Design a protein around this ligand. Sequence first.
Ligand code: ZN
Ligand code: ZN
Ligand code: ZN
Ligand code: ZN
Length: 72
Amino acid sequence: MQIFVKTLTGKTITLEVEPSDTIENVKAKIQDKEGIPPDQQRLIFAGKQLEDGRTLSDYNIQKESTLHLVLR
Ligand SMILES: [Zn+2]
Ligand SMILES: [Zn+2]
Ligand SMILES: [Zn+2]
Ligand SMILES: [Zn+2]
């Protein structure tokens, strides 16, 4: 699965993942790409707040899905 993560500035990060990847995995990938610490990342897909220990398939995230880094 290719998924897109948009930063707070709207920059697009393209990530190669698997359905079973955790949100924690995806956070580490984001850190590698952009230097954003995982403890400072908060991810949403389709308005769902994404928990570190759940997987992409748990949230029905699919090929070409977009996640957003948000605040607060
Ligand atoms: Zn793929
Ligand atoms: Zn694998
Ligand atoms: Zn993985
Ligand atoms: Zn793997």
